[PDB]
Amino acid sequence: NQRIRIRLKSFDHRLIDQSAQEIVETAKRTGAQVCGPIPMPTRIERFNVLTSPHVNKDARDQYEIRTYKRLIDIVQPTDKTVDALMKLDLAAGVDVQIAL
Amino acid sequence: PRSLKKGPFVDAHLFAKVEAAVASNSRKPIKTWSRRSMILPDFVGLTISVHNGRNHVPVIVTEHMVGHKLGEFAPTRTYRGH
Amino acid sequence: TNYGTGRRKTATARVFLSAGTGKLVINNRTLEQYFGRETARMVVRQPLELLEATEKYDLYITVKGGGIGGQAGAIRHGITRALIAADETLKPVLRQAGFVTRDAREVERKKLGLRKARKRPQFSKR
Amino acid sequence: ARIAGVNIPDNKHAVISLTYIFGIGRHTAKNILAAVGITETTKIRELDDAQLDAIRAEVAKVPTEGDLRREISMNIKRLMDLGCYRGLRHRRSLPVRGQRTKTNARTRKGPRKPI
């Protein structure tokens, strides 16, 4: 009854999708069943920054930053599965959390 | 107002001065900048020179002012009319 | 038996149409129990009343999101789509009535420098 | 009916009529009526003389008109004599609780005084 839970967090949805595809392909190659990836709701943070140095309250830039999350489940993990996942490279800009 | 479970607030340096005077009986005024200190029952009968920003105003402590802050008897703004 | 999905102002309704005597349940409640005002009740009954088949079918409806008016509109849209699924020949009549069109109107965002979507702060040239 | 030296309305509900006395609000009227067992919706004119006597007995526990007005007067006078900051504000007839006076002090300052 061993299930591997992988959570991916990123600021770039293309990067997170690429990482999730890589993980899923590796797990499928190692002969293990995979459920996912499941897209969790995105977090959006907004900021209003005055652009003028002294006085223009109506002159602002509106910025946002997004946090994307993906969930991958591995069931019936083969012996080579864990070693392959650990050997998988860590790409910058994607945070990967593994739970057993 | 300050919570009752915490008790009244008095600065330690001022409290030591009034305690020394009351243990003795010196009548010279006690000079302080502590406008925020609460007037205690022990304060009654003493003269406290409270700073008001530029001068020290003398206040003679009577029974009716127990429970007031020291700064309520030393106004800090000057106004006479327009 | 047949299924329909209705949408109106962030409100989504799932409608399950069958053949029956006229039973109608919304979120495990009667129509009168669920909708307080008469017009909401009438908007829901508009399609079957138009088709004259109020007693021909049984409805199982769930709805989520929006307010009372949005939910009533979504339920009407879902019933229309379920009827379309049941019979394609009813589409001209329902489209003529106007029940097929999805109302795409939505709340406009507040904009920087304005009090609302369009309302502007008061101006004083003097 | 005359209660505490005040002619409270006869055609209103008791809970509303009893607030016509100085020092009694809606909460105090509710407390008074609940302690003599009279429903809040009974009008004053529908009350027995014994019921009115019970209401008068209950009202006597609360400071209502003359005692209350004198107490407030003494409270203000004590500050004004003591000369604390609140007493000075009471003397000048200016806001006492830290409100702005550069504008919007008309309740305490009365109508506008031309220069």
Added chain:
Amino acid sequence: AKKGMINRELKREKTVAKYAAKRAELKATIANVNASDEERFEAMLKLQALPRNASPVRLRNRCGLTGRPHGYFRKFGLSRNKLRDTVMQGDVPGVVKASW
């Protein structure tokens, strides 16, 4: 900001860090219900006898680059001017112009 103000801020952070532990201990002793009333009173007296700069409420967030005390944006640690500059240059990961 001026160098004096920046150094004042630094000294205040240093004092808060130096006195962090004892302040927490005294506050816990004050909150203790099993402790004696005299013990809690003494703890309160010592807390009031601590130096003023040990209190965290006297810290003011300043821009990490210029020292500006207004418009701080806790998340980035920069005031609005430097935040606008850096975001529009592209040195802040994930932040883009927002439109919806």
Added chain:
Amino acid sequence: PRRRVVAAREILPDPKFSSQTIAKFMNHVMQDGKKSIAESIVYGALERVQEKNKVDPVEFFETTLEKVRPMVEVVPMEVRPSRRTALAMRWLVDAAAKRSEKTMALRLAGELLDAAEGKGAAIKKREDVHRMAEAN
């Protein structure tokens, strides 16, 4: 506008009588988006007039509206058909506001009956517009 001609905004018939006239009256009565309160106010009058004197609720309202309908603007000009109903509804709302009764619905029904019989501030105002028309 200036260059365009804006298509008139078509309003749906009311879901009870399928009467665009009653729907427009409800829109004139309604304030700050409270449609249900206006519906109650109008429907109370429609039901109460039926009880007081038996006529069709739609027909009685149409006849009274036609009675209060003006036909002259203000330089004389005739009113186009839309503004006749638009001005009759406003007059019937404004005048029915000022009669004294417990509910707005009862006041509205009362002045509906009154204007049916030729008395009402609405048809005084109509005759005043008639006087001003005769002036020029």
Added chain:
RNA sequence: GGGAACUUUAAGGAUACUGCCAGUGACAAACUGGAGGAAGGCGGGGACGACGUCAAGUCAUCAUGGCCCUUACGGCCAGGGCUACACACGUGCUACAAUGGUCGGUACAAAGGGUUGCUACACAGCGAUGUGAUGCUAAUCUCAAAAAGCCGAUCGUAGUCCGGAUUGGAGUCUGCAACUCGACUCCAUGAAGUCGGAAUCGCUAGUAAUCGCGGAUCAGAAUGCCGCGGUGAAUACGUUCCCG
């Protein structure tokens, strides 16, 4: 237990192109109407602001030429002030009530925040809150009660069961510390105000109007600002004059 249908979550695609029909235009560009379609001629909204103008704004974000101070125009500290108050103006909030106030019962959102944090539940308190305790690093637990709405009762046009200013008396919490000068709670009080001159402002549709919810700053301190949804109008004949 179970299912992968539906809602949704979120990546990638499809669709709309005057495509089809009719009439006009000039026999062009274009323009009007109809079918189908979720949508029809630019479907709605955001971002994006040419060459230039005003010695416009900012030496107090920062950088920088030049000038000036150097036991002081530099640096440290405690207390006070930026919160003053005969007055005038700008931008707002709350009202003047019955399309309403109060009480009882009962429905329907979206978006956002949470580990120095948000807290289920229980007990105590009228209450602000306090204590114990539980889950949560969150599509998992929580802020959280949406409010206007619907049903019933009552008030009956009164400065009122409207309004909620001001003042008296008690408290809670943050904080080393609420006097000057915090927010909130309870009792008492109950001001002006009866829809506002000349003049003037916003808005063409999910808009105006009205109702509630969240966040940045932040120990505490929004009627401001930036967002979110609920209910949901009226009127555009036309360019004669007002302005640009």
